Amino acid sequence: RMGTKMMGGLGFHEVLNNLISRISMDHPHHTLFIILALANANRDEFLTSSQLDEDRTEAANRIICTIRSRRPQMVRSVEALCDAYIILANLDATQWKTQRKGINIPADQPITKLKNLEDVVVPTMEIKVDHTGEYGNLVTIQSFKAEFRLAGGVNLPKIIDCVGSDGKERRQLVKGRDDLRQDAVMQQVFQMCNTLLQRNTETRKRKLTICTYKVVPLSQRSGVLEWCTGTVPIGEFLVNNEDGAHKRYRPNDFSAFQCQKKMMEVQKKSFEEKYEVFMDVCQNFQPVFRYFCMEKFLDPAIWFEKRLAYTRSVATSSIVGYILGLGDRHVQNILINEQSAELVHIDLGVAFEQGKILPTPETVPFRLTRDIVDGMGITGVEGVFRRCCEKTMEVMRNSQETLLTIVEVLLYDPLFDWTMNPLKALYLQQRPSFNKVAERVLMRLQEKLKGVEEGTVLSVGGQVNLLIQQAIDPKNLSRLFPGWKAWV
Amino acid sequence: LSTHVQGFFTSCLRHCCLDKKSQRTMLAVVDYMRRQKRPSSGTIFNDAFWLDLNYLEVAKVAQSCAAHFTALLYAEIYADKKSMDDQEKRSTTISSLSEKSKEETGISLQDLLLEIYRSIGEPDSLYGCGGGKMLQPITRLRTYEHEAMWGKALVTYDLETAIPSSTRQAGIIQALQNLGLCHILSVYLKGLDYENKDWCPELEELHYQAAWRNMQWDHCGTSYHESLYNALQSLRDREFSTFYESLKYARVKEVEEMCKRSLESVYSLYPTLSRLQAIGELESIGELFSRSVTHRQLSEVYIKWQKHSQLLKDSDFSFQEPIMALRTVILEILMEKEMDNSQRECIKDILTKHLVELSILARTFKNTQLPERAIFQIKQYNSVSCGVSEWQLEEAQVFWAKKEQSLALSILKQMIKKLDASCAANNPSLKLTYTECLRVCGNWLAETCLENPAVIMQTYLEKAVEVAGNYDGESSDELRNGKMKAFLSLAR
Amino acid sequence: EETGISLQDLLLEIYRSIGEPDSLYGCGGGKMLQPITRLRTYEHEAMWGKALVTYDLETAIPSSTRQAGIIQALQNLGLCHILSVYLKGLDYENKDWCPELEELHYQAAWRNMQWDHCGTSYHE
Amino acid sequence: ILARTFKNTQLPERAIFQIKQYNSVSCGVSEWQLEEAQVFWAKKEQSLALSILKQMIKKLDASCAANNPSLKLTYTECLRVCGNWLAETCLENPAVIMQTYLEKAVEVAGNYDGESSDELRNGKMKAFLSLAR
Amino acid sequence: FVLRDVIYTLIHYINQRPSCIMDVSLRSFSLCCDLLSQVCQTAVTYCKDALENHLHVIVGTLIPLVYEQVEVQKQVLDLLKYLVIDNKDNENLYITIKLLDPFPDHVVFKDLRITQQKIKYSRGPFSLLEEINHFLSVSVYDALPLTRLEGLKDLRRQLELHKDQMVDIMRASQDNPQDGIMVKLVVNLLQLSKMAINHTGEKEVLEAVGSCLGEVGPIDFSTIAIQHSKDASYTKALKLFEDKELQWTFIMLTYLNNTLVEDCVK
Ligand SMILES: Nc1ncnc2c1ncn2[C@@H]1O[C@H](COP(=O)(O)OP(=O)(O)NP(=O)(O)O)[C@@H](O)[C@H]1O
Ligand SMILES: [Mg+2]
């Protein structure tokens, strides 16, 4: 909201600038990267629009100068670190697409040169807030490793290792040609939902939380985020062609490739043919996710604890994502922690039921496919999952006012590009007035928080039952995009 | 090896093997073999079948040997193997698998799963395996007790007669106690003793529990509640040696009874920990009762009790209620016993605070009869004065929780009128009560739509803010909290 | 303070005598907190659990009406076995027998088909 | 039924217990089992009522073969009430509710051709109204 | 091996003895005590780290011995003073002196208690978490419940007057409740109580455990399955061997070595 047009004795912009300056000076480690990203919105083309953008850039530059006046060393060194990060992101690295061993970082990159930045806390870490202004004994960046790994994708992000003051490595994912501000905002909402869950006894006793990771956008088209070490994509564990769980445990069933091909063939056909093909595929494709906890945790007590944690994580994530209208929950967008068996949701670009606007609309509130339920045990959705879903929905309903206020603050953020556009819709599904929309989304969220679904008021249990029935309905799953992999 | 091991495991359930040590040895053999990789390339599920085992019988034996997690894992393995075998043969939910297992090996999978989940003690998992014996009265009563549906449990216990008399009477007594009904419970126990001469130990324990909870001091191996009653009676009689002896015996008995269990689930420890904490609190109060009693010692004892209650904020109500009841009995004994120094007012205030805390705790756990009983106990020792007290506000809150809005509003309005007539910005203690009463009355009137917004804002909310702030009784923490709450209500 | 008669109490008694159910809510402001009025409200609304709890709790109520209300609340909730054991304990605890308790005992005896329990009243 | 109408739940349970004292469970179900399911529904115990009604429906389907005129009304009412309860609780998708319960109740009431009755006419009217709704 | 065998043989001789002591029994007892003292002195003099593994059992055996006749009491106190007081400056023995169980509150134990408490508190004052950690670390040494009795009392004091720090402890254990220190302490106390069953002075140990468990009531531990303390050294030793036969050999050798300190001669 920073600007320059209405500065004055009682102007909004001057008061906002003073408040933001005070916040930045009291807590530089929580605000410097944000303000620099605002100031470095168009740094990408520099290294290699509207009046609002220029006003925001000028105000951010003013805040940077004011911060630098009292503490110049940290500002200069953080600027150098951000420049090195953006330069590393802009690296093409198209030749090493086939290599998975670790590519040595070129000596030209400035990230290799910089060592011992005592004034820079690691951006990936979560910095605890102390009310006393002094910050001390914080883990600062010491150096970076000389090797970077390549992650699969259309545009290849880079996995780097940062060695901090304590000498312990932390893996970071550097991305370019993509916007990370949406992910950071969604992480903020996830943190607020976790705080709401913590302060209620019913959900605190069950330890219901949403797994979160730190995202730091460095420009309008680049960023660095926390790499969730010890996690594997659920699709990688399940339907990997070489040593996937489906291939290992059910050799005589359909291969994942066969199911995918059969699903694509029926795409341009009638709905009845889609449903019958989906049923035939599900007949020859049985879930095997229950073997995830069995093969990793041989001790029965640890196995039971990990399975319970997995089920609780699935329930909490499903309810929270339904409240926020999270979409694009395909197998590569969900990771599972190998140590704790808890689910982490990534790629949060699609939310607030924008996925229903897609060419092939998403007909499910969340992902509750056969493998997800099979991972819950012999009882399935009954028992822990349904009760935890009811508890999470009860907490959500009890905090509808605060949640609605937070989403109101989100939706009117000028820099939050949450609405669906044709280019984004086409990129999501490829094959070989704003105020009106915001008000509609807010009213839909209000209806969800009050338990109104189809014009009828439902209890927490009834709403949970309706959501589970919609999520597990084969008719809805048969209509989904093949990339969603509803049969997995 | 497969046929002989299967024969051994079926011998355990024939009911022949009846020695727990041999069953544990063979279960250890199975557990070790489960973790080894077979020479042929395969998965962990294949590694689970070094021998052609029937894992349902092994799971039943493990449950008999109190290996609940192992039994659950073996039941899951058996279900998976049965499904795979059925699919291979053809080239079914839990109920169908249970029917087939019952007609093949004689063990119902659903019943075994329900027993395993009951043994584990995880509350939500009890809803997963429900389809079996839903209509059976025992399962219904267990569900009612788990959900604290004490009225439904009492009705079902009274109705069903095929249940054995001992457990039926135990459930009736528990349901009566959990709903208050102390006089009804005492008369029921008297009638039961009239109708039967034979006395079973569990009914004796329940009778002793009712005797000490209701302060019936003429009711007089030793059990826990008998030991508690004897210790309380000795404390009243100032018999301290036998008091300490009985407390020590009860402590040793509790620990010994805990030692003979499986020690596999954390939920098995909580009742023992609650009993031991109650015994420790009684023992601590014993020393204070022995020597002279002063304001400072009572204050420190109550502060320690409040700290331990804060440590127990996440515990279940079933583990906190006995401690609160024992604290109430201890305080009432302390007040009732010889006090000629006129400093029984300190115990009166301490007991009032304790009963307000108990009412708040019972309200938090959706219980309404216990707060009413606590309010009655408060009114027994207290009266209505010009300077109102916090227990009247607590009573109004209790009546609100009972879905009796008119009564709570009337009580709060009378409280506000009395405070306005009495207080003139002179009593710092009355300030917080006045502000909270005004704020709560305004919030309730807003919620019920019984008053227009203008009157609610003029008379209650801004008035609460003005009382909290313009009185200028600053330099306090509770005042800061009350000011924050009033500001938030007015802002909302 | 002038004539010694409370208008609100008189109105409440008149409306109770008339027996019109809704009119009982018109004059409520008097003696809302009194246990007798609360118990009458609970009985009028068939809140038998609340009536039973309040009857058990409050002791200043005379024993005869307290026991009558307890028995009525127990009967209206079923609880035939509990009611019978309560009556047995009550007879154990007291030798003097008032006529209303005798009528209630006879009512419980015929309702529960206790045929060994044996001016005459209706239930007798 | 009368105690349920007056918002009383303990008396219907006692009456159901008294019924079960003298009666048992047979292949040809009776109306008191449906009444017990209704009582459990009035107790806000929806899972128990649904389980009882589904067991009733399964037993009726296994036993009856459009042969008993008395069982026809019970079967139709059980199917209609189960469909309505499943619709109210949102525990089943509309397609299964319509295929298995509502149209099935209409078919049982009408295609069996056990006409010339008043209770049959009332049951047919209720099933038609439920399907229409 | 000879050192360990001699100490364990003498300890077994001392532990089992007639309640009534005659002249020949007293002479045999004095001979055992003298031989134990001579062996301890020689081993300490010529090998500083010789007693780092056998000090705990020797002290636990000698402690009940002072509640006896004066003649044997003189020898037992002389041996205890030589082991503890006379070798406080010894660097290889100072580590193991810190970890032994506290001595009972008695006038005869005044000097030994003072020395041991200073050796324990030389670094500084102890917090509640530090006290619990020390109590848990002492456990792994000797499987004799009665020897721990005094330590139990000490714990019951701290949990009585450091309840404020228990809130901070539970808060610190919230994120990872599987290895919460309080549930670990409860499980260790219950294991100790199980060990005390069917042993001399079991009621006192049970009462101490009951008091300790009454100090920490039914606190929600946020965990379902009880985990037992497992030896990390054993696990690391197992990681070394890849062959199944080598792991079997290691397990059998560990069992055989652990059985060598048993009273039975066969
Ligand atoms: N925060 C993270 N922690 C761990 N692994 C991650 C994380 N984010 C992404 N990955 C991995 O990197 C892969 C690439 O995913 P992503 O970063 O979303 O790029 P993408 O697949 O192209 N989706 P997008 O870039 O938004 O079009 C994922 O499939 C994961 O295996
Ligand atoms: Mg992706």
Coordinates of C-alpha atoms in Angstrom, one line a residue, chain C residues 22-111:
Chain C
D22 CA -48.7 -19.0 27.9
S23 CA -49.8 -16.5 30.6
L24 CA -47.3 -18.0 33.0
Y25 CA -44.5 -16.3 31.0
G26 CA -46.1 -12.8 31.3
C27 CA -45.4 -12.2 35.0
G28 CA -42.0 -13.7 35.5
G29 CA -39.8 -10.9 36.9
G30 CA -40.9 -11.9 40.4
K31 CA -38.9 -14.7 42.2
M32 CA -37.2 -15.9 39.0
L33 CA -34.2 -17.2 41.2
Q34 CA -36.5 -18.8 43.7
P35 CA -36.1 -22.6 43.4
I36 CA -39.9 -23.3 43.6
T37 CA -40.6 -21.1 40.6
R38 CA -37.8 -22.6 38.7
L39 CA -39.0 -26.1 39.4
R40 CA -42.6 -25.1 38.4
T41 CA -41.2 -23.8 35.1
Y42 CA -39.2 -27.0 34.6
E43 CA -42.3 -29.2 35.2
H44 CA -44.4 -27.0 32.9
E45 CA -41.9 -27.3 30.1
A46 CA -41.4 -31.1 30.8
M47 CA -37.7 -30.5 31.7
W48 CA -37.6 -33.5 33.9
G49 CA -33.8 -33.8 34.1
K50 CA -33.5 -30.2 35.2
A51 CA -36.3 -30.6 37.6
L52 CA -34.7 -33.7 39.1
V53 CA -31.3 -32.0 39.4
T54 CA -32.9 -29.0 41.1
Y55 CA -35.0 -31.1 43.5
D56 CA -31.9 -33.1 44.5
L57 CA -29.8 -30.0 45.0
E58 CA -32.1 -27.7 46.9
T59 CA -32.7 -28.7 50.5
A60 CA -34.7 -25.8 52.0
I61 CA -37.7 -27.1 50.1
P62 CA -40.0 -29.1 52.4
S63 CA -39.3 -32.9 52.3
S64 CA -42.8 -33.9 51.2
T65 CA -43.0 -31.8 48.1
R66 CA -39.3 -32.4 47.3
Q67 CA -39.8 -36.2 47.4
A68 CA -43.0 -35.9 45.4
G69 CA -41.2 -33.9 42.7
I70 CA -38.3 -36.3 42.7
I71 CA -40.6 -39.2 42.2
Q72 CA -42.6 -37.4 39.5
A73 CA -39.4 -36.5 37.6
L74 CA -38.1 -40.1 37.9
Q75 CA -41.3 -41.5 36.6
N76 CA -41.5 -39.1 33.7
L77 CA -38.0 -40.2 32.6
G78 CA -38.7 -43.9 32.9
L79 CA -36.2 -45.1 35.4
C80 CA -38.7 -47.6 36.9
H81 CA -35.9 -49.7 38.6
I82 CA -34.2 -46.6 40.0
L83 CA -37.5 -45.2 41.2
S84 CA -38.3 -48.5 43.0
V85 CA -34.9 -48.7 44.7
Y86 CA -35.3 -45.0 45.7
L87 CA -38.7 -45.8 47.2
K88 CA -37.3 -48.8 49.1
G89 CA -34.4 -46.6 50.4
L90 CA -36.8 -43.9 51.4
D91 CA -39.0 -46.4 53.3
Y92 CA -35.8 -47.7 55.0
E93 CA -34.8 -44.2 56.1
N94 CA -38.2 -43.2 57.5
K95 CA -40.9 -44.9 59.5
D96 CA -43.5 -42.2 59.4
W97 CA -45.6 -42.4 56.3
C98 CA -47.4 -39.4 54.9
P99 CA -50.5 -40.0 52.6
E100 CA -49.1 -38.4 49.5
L101 CA -46.0 -40.6 49.6
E102 CA -48.3 -43.6 50.1
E103 CA -50.2 -42.6 47.0
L104 CA -47.0 -42.2 45.0
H105 CA -45.8 -45.6 46.2
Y106 CA -49.1 -47.2 45.1
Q107 CA -48.8 -45.5 41.7
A108 CA -45.3 -46.9 41.3
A109 CA -46.4 -50.3 42.4
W110 CA -49.2 -50.6 39.9
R111 CA -47.3 -49.0 37.1

